[PDB]
Enzyme design. Sequence first.
Site, mmCIF file in Angstrom:
data_model
loop_
_atom_site.group_PDB
_atom_site.id
_atom_site.type_symbol
_atom_site.label_atom_id
_atom_site.label_comp_id
_atom_site.label_asym_id
_atom_site.label_seq_id
_atom_site.Cartn_x
_atom_site.Cartn_y
_atom_site.Cartn_z
ATOM 1 N N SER A 60 -0.269 15.468 -12.350
ATOM 2 C CA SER A 60 -0.501 15.079 -13.728
ATOM 3 C C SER A 60 -0.689 16.329 -14.583
ATOM 4 O O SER A 60 -1.201 17.339 -14.119
ATOM 5 C CB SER A 60 -1.736 14.160 -13.814
ATOM 6 O OG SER A 60 -2.092 13.873 -15.151
ATOM 7 N N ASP B 212 0.828 -1.201 0.000
ATOM 8 C CA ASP B 212 0.000 0.000 0.000
ATOM 9 C C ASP B 212 0.866 1.256 0.000
ATOM 10 O O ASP B 212 1.334 1.689 1.047
ATOM 11 C CB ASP B 212 -0.906 -0.030 1.236
ATOM 12 C CG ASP B 212 -1.820 1.176 1.340
ATOM 13 O OD1 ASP B 212 -1.930 1.941 0.352
ATOM 14 O OD2 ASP B 212 -2.452 1.322 2.415
HETATM 15 N N1 GGB Z 1 -6.677 2.846 0.501
HETATM 16 C C1 GGB Z 1 -5.420 2.722 0.942
HETATM 17 N N2 GGB Z 1 -4.458 3.398 0.312
HETATM 18 N N3 GGB Z 1 -5.112 1.889 1.935
HETATM 19 O O1 GGB Z 1 -5.803 0.783 2.468
HETATM 20 C C2 GGB Z 1 -6.835 0.150 1.704
HETATM 21 C C3 GGB Z 1 -7.449 -0.878 2.620
HETATM 22 C C4 GGB Z 1 -8.801 -0.251 2.911
HETATM 23 N N4 GGB Z 1 -9.714 -1.189 3.590
HETATM 24 C C5 GGB Z 1 -9.436 0.134 1.558
HETATM 25 O O2 GGB Z 1 -10.030 -0.680 0.880
HETATM 26 O O3 GGB Z 1 -9.256 1.394 1.211
#
Ligand code: GGB
EC number: 3.4.23.22
Length: 330
Positions: free
Chosen positions: A199, A35
């Site tokens: 961007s 992530d």
């Molecule tokens: N979104 C980010 N960057 N991090 O975590 C994602 C896990 C979170 N449950 C989701 O689905 O967003």
Amino acid sequence: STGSATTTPIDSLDDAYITPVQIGTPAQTLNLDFDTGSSDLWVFSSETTASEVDGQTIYTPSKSTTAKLLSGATWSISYGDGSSSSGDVYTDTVSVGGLTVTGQAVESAKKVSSSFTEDSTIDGLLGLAFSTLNTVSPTQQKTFFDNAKASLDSPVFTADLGYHAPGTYNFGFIDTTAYTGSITYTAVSTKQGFWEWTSTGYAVGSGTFKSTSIDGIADTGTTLLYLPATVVSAYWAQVSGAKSSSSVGGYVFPCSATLPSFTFGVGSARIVIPGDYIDFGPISTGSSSCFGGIQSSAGIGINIFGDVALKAAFVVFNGATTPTLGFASK
Ligand SMILES: N=C(N)NOCC[C@H](N)C(=O)O
């Protein structure tokens, strides 16, 4: 040193990608969601409330001869989708694709929210944003990348996400066989702790390119592409029957549609997202209304170049003293 690990979609929609990670001695292999939008490495564990574990593989620190409780340290995180987790912290040996970090903070979940419990395929997250976002208290901890950096051949990692297919995360080197053409590099602001960049514009399908600055983050942990309402409206206006649905929570479109591509600018270069990448399937099983992969960022407070955008490119996260981001077509 270098590392190289395959990352695999968790389902038929590429809702997220999991990458195997070895933790402890002997190794316990957990499948983590890498992530670039957060900075905590946390896992389901033997400490996780039993009713909140449903099929995940857990880390058991007591079975690791290299695990050590980081005395007094706790963590608690909330994500942009409203999900959350919290717990305590161990240090242990962590390896990704052959690259080993000793003394990595491994955040052991005591509690996780329902969306984590309900996703049996994701055993935790491995954060790759800047360590300034790490939630460990009272002593903030470093990400796996920050800990590995000095040992790497080059202070970089790359994300090469597949469309309906596996891809690769590499650490410490750029695989020049993994992309076409040249990599275009662009400036990064770390002021919010993210891989934040600007961007240079967009195009919808075969339409003319609109030159306009769009500040956003490169976030492998977000599924979709979230952009300003003006941009998103211009996209979906090219799809007959598409509309924003407050009941569903975004733009939907007839499943019978063929979607146009979406182009985004990286400097003078252009990355094309094929229309099929923007199709996230029926809103519910058997429905003829399909969910769009480009959605408005209004109300989020930030634009997010999530997996829909990133998987159209080979992406370099350059963690040199002045960080930058690189994009190539592939
Ligand atoms: N979104 C980010 N960057 N991090 O975590 C994602 C896990 C979170 N449950 C989701 O689905 O967003």
